[model samples]
Target: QEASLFLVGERLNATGSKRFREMLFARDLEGILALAREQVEEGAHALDLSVAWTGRDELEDLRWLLPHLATALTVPVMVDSTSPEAMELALKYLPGRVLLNSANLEDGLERFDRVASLAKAHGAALVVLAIDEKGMAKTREEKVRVALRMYERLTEHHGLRPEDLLFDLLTFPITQGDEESRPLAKETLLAMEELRERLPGVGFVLGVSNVSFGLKPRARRVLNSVFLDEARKRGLTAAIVDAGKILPISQIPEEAYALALDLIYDRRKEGFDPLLAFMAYFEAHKEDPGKREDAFLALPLLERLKRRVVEGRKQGLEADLEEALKAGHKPLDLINGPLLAGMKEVGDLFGAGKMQLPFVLQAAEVMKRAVAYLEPHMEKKGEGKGTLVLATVKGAVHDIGKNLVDIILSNNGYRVVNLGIKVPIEEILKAVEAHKPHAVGMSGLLVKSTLVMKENLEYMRDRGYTLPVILGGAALTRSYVEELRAIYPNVYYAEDAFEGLRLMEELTGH
Candidate 1:
């Protein structure tokens, strides 16, 4: 049954989408049925159902959803919830062969044994996440180690057939994240390729949308289709994406295709950060770069700063800045000049694929440092022109991009309250309630954060808090925010601090 499953319908998961969660919580059975039937009609051979969220009783939701989904849909259902009780309840009512959503080494041997026994007795297929108590398998060695370890336990101890197991090559969104997490697409693909040779007869699958998390609608769709095409080539036989999605490599735009390939294989040389290229690729795609660092850094001393940034060199940066200052350039001039100059080159080369991410961030850091060094000495007036509240939204920790936004906004005369990373939607609401600032800015650097941004905007809409909400960072786009305008009417997309200032000036009429 597991081997036969391909394109496990994904929209039913509550955590990933709002409308689905709304229907699930409201017990809108018809709406739920409509979505399920639509997914199957679109092309999903099977359905994956999960009922987990923050406050809801997941087990009870499972009890209510399982029987109906099992009966209403033609294909088999997989209980996608994490609760053992929910899984157990699913087995009791589901009439056909079941595909249990998962077990991980991190849950310890006892849980695996329990599920394995249940699977064996019921002749159910199982999905494994391949992470242990340590963490997710990050490399070829770690992935191989976890695969064999689980295979030995499930097959040897549980008496399940080899084909009964399905390994989910869990993928991260490729568009925006920290340094180590940016290449989630490549690492997962490489692992799947290795696992196919090492562990025969097992199915391989992924949640396709995760790879394209933070991109524009077209870019996201294109990336998903291209990624799926490549994943199938690398032994990924099944996926949990919508059947309506066009996943052919031919449909993907050249830019998105190049991006997927860059992540799947290491195309850059050593000592240069591939993430630089990744970051640059995202930046070059955005609509703004108004404060570019190119022309100003053409001076010899300024050109040196650009070199250190591109090479990611540590030494002599301070000396170069010191000389630039001595040559009669003011602090603000220095910040808006050579340092920004180098960073611009970093992004252009990276977007063009000549540079990578590690160096891109390194160069960004250098720009930030140079700005930091110059800011306190620069002419910042004693009073604020306007006030605004800024936050890095829930579950995102990449702060470099957000920090740049802060620096530019504050230095340009705006009074700011900067809430740091992993801030819940409630906190932003709380701040909006208290301050009533001129504008509200939300920042996120991961694909999930973009959804989190949408969630925050939704929460705001429910209460009618309609201030200008400006969104920025690596994982965002003009079209993405434009589409979101239907929900939060005042939402705005700002790719750079300059754009944000322009929006604020309009809103405040200053």
Candidate 2:
């Protein structure tokens, strides 16, 4: 339910360490502890320590390190190892609810049972990887078959609740010229979906990085992005990904090369250092900085960035936005970053009462032109995060302000199902019933639109639907919003685009 993503810190260990190919060990406890602290600070809810590749002496090393790791970090530690002896020793040092990295009904059923019992004894959760002695299943049915077998043992034999077990939908490589691997990837995903249907309470995970292994570095990121996207669609609850290389759900479906940008700059949480998010957006979308005109039209930044500047101008500021487009740089990048910078300055001036409405609107129109020129170059990959139904209700033609709000909302994230201009009450109800957005945003820049909002609210009440409704635009006054709130319980007011974003976040509880 919470924005789910796991930060796997195993790869951060010293060179030649357990999982490391070189003869490296976790010699620097201070460094490891520092890394753990950094990950926690970056919004990682859990940490996983993999001691599996220590080869023959894994148990000895784990025994030496477990107490130190537990003492250094505060988040829950996952004991990652294929060796039962190593896991058992690590468990002795871990005090809180730990995550037992795996068990499969494949090779060591007795050992698996012992580990499950140990986790039960310690009140720790168990991660069940669906692979047995028969090796990783290639088909969804086969994986499910293995899962069903494991479930029976964990429940009937070990007396473990289904809720305690989290299934790992085994990930496969995405090698070039290897056709067989693709089907297996889909199978793994399908297996997760099927398992979720059968056991709704059980959790799901994937070792997300494995998909990019052994591929060209440039291509690896693309593969990983596609894999994560597919895995997410398949109902995967958690993934062991490098926190620095993956944006949180809030910034996904972005125009920039997500994985590449995420790798370059990490922006992982809402309100998580806006400077970092801005820089990441700048770095990712500013590929051909010198080729500003061409770059602006490229995927992601063009339309959204341009629109923001436009909206700021509409608020009243003399933004020198057209100069950037004339400077022969990508219109998208200029508008998104530099031009947006200009508009923000204007907005600040307006906020401080140094500018007025007409000046702001003039600047906004310039910003809009810059963005319009850049839109054709943005990437058209994944779909929007969620659908949002935006309308002016019935008998309303005033939409310029609503159009601005729609652009801002779309840019901030949220798919707009815009019922353009004058929308009837029946049409509004139909769209809400069809799209089922997390929230419905209604705008009224005129008195007619205000009347439409009232009628729509009344109809929604009659239909017994409780979707949260947000009202905004020029015609909406504080007194008007207060009156509506008193008369209609569901109606709420958002005075600005930023406030609307906050309202949506609250309504969706994201």
Q: What is the TM-score of each candidate against the true structure?
A: 0.61, 0.47
Root-mean-square deviation of Cα positions for candidate 1 versus the true structure, in angstroms: 12.3
lDDT of 2 by residue, 43-141 (tens): 666777775552447776676667777777777777777677777677778766478887776676876787888778777889988788888777888
lDDT of each: 0.76, 0.64
How far out, in Å, is residue 127 in model 2?
1.2
In Å, residue 324's CA in model 2 sits off its true spot by: 52
Report how far residue 88 has shifted in candidate 2, in Å: 1.8
- Candidate 1 per-residue lDDT over residues 1-510, each given as its tens digit: 223338888888898878899999999999999999998888888888877999988978887877787778778787776667777888888845478887877768977777777778878888888788898887767777888899999888887787888887677765553556766677788888999998888888788888867545655666677778777887877788877875566566676577556655645554333434444555454534343334434548866776776656555567777787788878756655666676667878988977545566666666766767766766664357788988888888667656766777787788888888788878887887788788888888779889989989889899878888999978798999999999999999998777887897788776
Taking every candidate in turn, the Cα RMSD to the unseen true structure, in Å, is 12.3, 22.9
Off by over 4 Å in 1: 1-5, 269-333, 336-363, 366-510
At residue 148, candidate 2 shows an lDDT of: 88
